[PDB]
Curated annotation (Swiss-Prot), chains A, B:
Statement: the UniProt record of this protein carries the keyword Phosphoprotein: yes
Highest taxon of the lineage: Eukaryota
Tissue expression profile of the protein: Expressed in placenta, maternal decidua and fetal membranes. Within placenta, expressed in trophoblasts, stromal cells, villous endothelium, syncytiotrophoblast apical membrane and villous stroma. Within fetal membranes, expressed in amnion, chorioamniotic mesenchyma and chorion (at protein level). Expressed in cardiac, smooth, and skeletal muscle, neurons, thymus, kidney and hematopoietic cells.
Phosphoserine sites (modified residues): 28
Keywords: Acetylation, Apoptosis, Cytoplasm, Extracellular matrix, Lectin, Phosphoprotein, Secreted
A GO term for molecular function: RNA binding
Name of the protein described by the UniProt record: Galectin-1
Location(s), subcellular: Secreted, Extracellular space, Extracellular matrix; Cytoplasm; Secreted
Complex formation: Homodimer. Binds LGALS3BP. Interacts with CD2, CD3, CD4, CD6, CD7, CD43, ALCAM and CD45. Interacts with laminin (via poly-N-acetyllactosamine). Interacts with SUSD2. Interacts with cargo receptor TMED10; the interaction mediates the translocation from the cytoplasm into the ERGIC (endoplasmic reticulum-Golgi intermediate compartment) and thereby secretion. Interacts with CD69.
Keyword Cell cycle: no
InterPro entries for the chain: ConA-like_dom_sf, Galectin-like, Galectin_CRD
Natural source organism: Homo sapiens
CDD domains found in the cross-reference section: GLECT
């Protein structure tokens, strides 16, 4: 398992920056943000080659242990064997995920969290730096 | 309390860099490093004015929940209401703590830890950035 951080107290409008190395043979990696492992306002899962998906960003939420409705994006600004930075902010309506190569997208904030306190990384992504503005 | 991080997977010789904000009314702050909350190879407690200490860094270990013997350092390159970076590395014998303004000291690796997987901050120090070299 990857880096797990709690007590982040990330408030609306604040920016969470995560930079890591994508494994040369990476198949997928995960960044989870929320209250705890059962309450995720963002499950961010770029799949290079996993679950039959190729170069697809899979996003979902988890509310009291229940996965929400999966959504998929249409751009994949990740390459195996390279450094990638992911930058995330949220308000009550949406999380805004900013990725390399200028790409940005929004994911509905389906939970009722006053602040993002929990982050967990998994998969083929070696965290090198985490910043809270 | 402050930020808590697990699964750090910090190995001997690797450098953990922590940048944060010392509160303007700082009396004391803490950075704990170890295997988990009950097994700390470093309890790093700069005291501006707390527990009878003035401008003194107090270090200790915790072994299966039992505090070790405190060690008091000779330098204190910290100021209230400022940004400070601490950089930690370790090996079989010692942790090396590098401080602002070129100061550093060593603290024995009392638990003989070969990996640091846990970090926690408390007190008047808001972590803004954590990097792994
Ligand atoms: C016709 C519809 C088919 O229906 C499918 O149904 C599956 C199960 O419901 C979904 O799959 C699930 O989708 C969820 C989001 O919705 C989560 O992603 C979940 O994973 C949870 C999870 C697992 N993990 C561990 C982990 C994750 C990534 C890498 C590693 C690695 C590595 C070893 N390497 C290292 N250490 N370097 C480990 N974390 N979170 C995933 O299984 C599919 O998407 C979905 N597909 C579609 C098209 O709808
Ligand atoms: C009894 C008379 C004299 O004898 C003293 O006896 C004390 C208790 O045994 C020792 O003190 C203890 O020493 C330990 C190391 O060995 C730990 O440091 C421990 O603290 C554990 C601890 C507490 N915490 C939370 C925390 C720590 C610092 C600041 C804040 C907070 C807040 C509010 N501000 C915000 N939010 N901005 C919160 N973390 N670790 C500390 O109490 C003193 O050294 C010792 N002094 C001397 C000179 O002998």
């Amino acid at each position: 398992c990857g880096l797990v951080a709690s007590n982040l107290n990330l408030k609306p409008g604040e920016c969470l920056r995560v930079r890591g190395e994508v494994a040369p043979d990476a198949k997928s990696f995960v960044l989870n943000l929320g209250k705890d492992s059962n309450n995720l306002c963002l499950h961010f899962n770029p799949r290079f080659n996993a679950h039959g998906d190729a170069n697809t960003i899979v996003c979902n939420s988890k509310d009291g242990g229940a996965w929400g409705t999966e959504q998929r994006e249409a751009v994949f600004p990740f390459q195996p064997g390279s450094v990638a930075e992911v930058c995330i902010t949220f308000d009550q309506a949406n999380l805004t995920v900013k990725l390399p190569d200028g790409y940005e997208f929004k994911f509905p904030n389906r939970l009722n969290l006053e602040a993002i306190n929990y982050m967990a990384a998994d998969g083929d992504f070696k965290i090198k730096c985490v910043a809270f503005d």
